[PDB]
Write a protein that binds this ligand. Structure first.
Ligand code: HEM
Ligand SMILES: [Ca+2]
Ligand SMILES: [Ca+2]
Length: 390
């Protein structure tokens, strides 16, 4: 009964979970502005139209009939909520974490030492972002396995459009949401008279010291930062290593000149971002490519398709660490531009620097994709590895 969910189940989610890209190409070329008659929802595939839908707030609203987070809010309230944490997520504040993120990354590859096969996701790309986001928020990272279980549910989709699968899915997801929410409620209660140098303390101060934040928006805020904080960066690390190993010689280029890694992270955000789409609702009649959109019509904006648009990028289908002019919209565009982009850039850089120093070779054995998800990425990534001579 969620039209956006139905539209994903009718389109995106009918494609290979780790290879939606031929489908995006087909839509770009044949139906770049597509009405799903079943769901009553538009999809846009081309760079200029996706970029406009996500940024043109005069016409495209974030607020539908996580619901109580900045993600689902329009100005003026959006500006006040985002400003609570805007300063805390700046490149310069996240730079203070580079030492701690290096240590966490080191410790994980430490524990992998002496193994000829690793599960990148279980051993590395899941634990590091869950641990960093736990320490930033101010919760114990010893809960990472439960955090991962809850996060995977909160970004999941039913296995099909079939009412029984949707109901089964609603039950399990709702239970995840209840238990994660109870968790944060317990954390808040504890932190109110034991504040830390941490983001949950910042939120509590905003709710307690004035009316910047409602009591019913603390736990939503926690859920959003916990879940985004790991589901995005986990899948961006995994997807980036996969992108590198897919293109022979890329591994050795980056290892031989690690100053390229920041560019290669931007290329991984263009090429295999963890967030392939976002959604808007039309709040004012408009047109894209002469197609008329009416107030109240939902729109899915395929960032992943925009970032592969032949019209916007040369060799858009190629992973090119040397992309000189890359103006990807993989973090979004305009007022909802990813709050975590600096953290994500910093974690992914450090993750990849570590892997390229630790391993002189890595080869894919198997993967299990994130199927039935809002996210694009890997549940498992088994690799044969050879540790470098030091
Ligand atoms: C790792 C790669 C990441 C990608 C590709 C990514 C992508 C996105 C995109 C496209 C948006 C815009 C959504 C929209 O316009 O509707 C967004 C928003 C956001 N992301 Fe990220 N994200 C990443 C990492 C993170 C991290 C690590 C966190 C938390 C630390 C985070 C927290 C957020 C929040 C809170 C918003 C909402 C901003 C707002 O509504 O004003 N993201 N992200
Ligand atoms: Ca709203
Ligand atoms: Ca208050």
């Amino acid at each position: 009964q969620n039209p956006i969910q139905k539209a994903l189940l009718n389109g995106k989610n009918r494609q290979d979970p780790y290879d939606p890209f031929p489908w995006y190409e087909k839509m770009r070329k044949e139906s770049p502005v597509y009405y799903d008659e079943d769901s009553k929802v538009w999809s846009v595939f081309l760079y200029d139209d996706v970029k406009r839908v996500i940024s043109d707030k005069d016409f495209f609203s974030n607020q539908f009939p996580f619901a109580k987070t900045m993600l689902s809010m329009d100005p003026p309230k959006h500006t006040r909520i985002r400003s609570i944490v805007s300063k805390a997520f700046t490149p310069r504040i996240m730079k203070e974490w580079e030492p701690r993120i290096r240590v966490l990354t080191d410790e994980l590859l430490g524990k992998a030492r002496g193994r000829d096969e690793i599960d990148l996701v279980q051993d590395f790309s899941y634990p590091l972002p869950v641990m960093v986001i736990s320490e930033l928020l101010g919760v114990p990272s010893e809960h990472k396995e439960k955090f991962k279980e809850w996060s995977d549910l909160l970004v999941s989709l039913p296995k099909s459009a079939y009412e029984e699968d949707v109901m089964e899915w609603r039950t399990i997801r709702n239970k995840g949401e209840e238990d994660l929410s109870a968790f944060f409620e317990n954390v808040i209660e504890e932190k109110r008279r034991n504040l830390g140098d941490d983001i949950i303390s910042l939120l509590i101060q905003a709710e307690e010291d004035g009316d910047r934040l409602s009591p019913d928006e603390l736990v939503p805020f926690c859920n959003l930062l916990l879940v985004a904080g790991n589901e995005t960066t986990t899948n961006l690390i995994s997807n980036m290593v996969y992108s590198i190993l897919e293109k022979p010689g890329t591994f050795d280029e980056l290892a031989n000149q690690p100053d390229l890694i920041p560019q290669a992270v931007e290329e991984a955000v263009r090429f295999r971002a963890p967030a392939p789409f976002t959604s808007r609702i039309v709040q004012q009649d408009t047109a894209i490519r002469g197609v008329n959109l009416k107030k109240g019509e939902g729109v899915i904006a395929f960032l992943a398709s925009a970032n592969r648009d032949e019209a916007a990028f040369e060799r858009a289908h190629e992973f090119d660490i040397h992309r000189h002019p890359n103006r990807h919209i993989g973090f979004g565009h305009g007022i909802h531009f990813c709050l975590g982009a600096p953290l994500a850039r910093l974690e992914t850089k450090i993750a990849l620097e570590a892997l390229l120093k630790q391993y002189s070779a890595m080869e894919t054995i198997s993967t299990e994709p994130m199927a039935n998800s809002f996210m694009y990425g890997l549940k498992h990534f088994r690799l044969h590895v050879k540790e470098a001579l030091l």
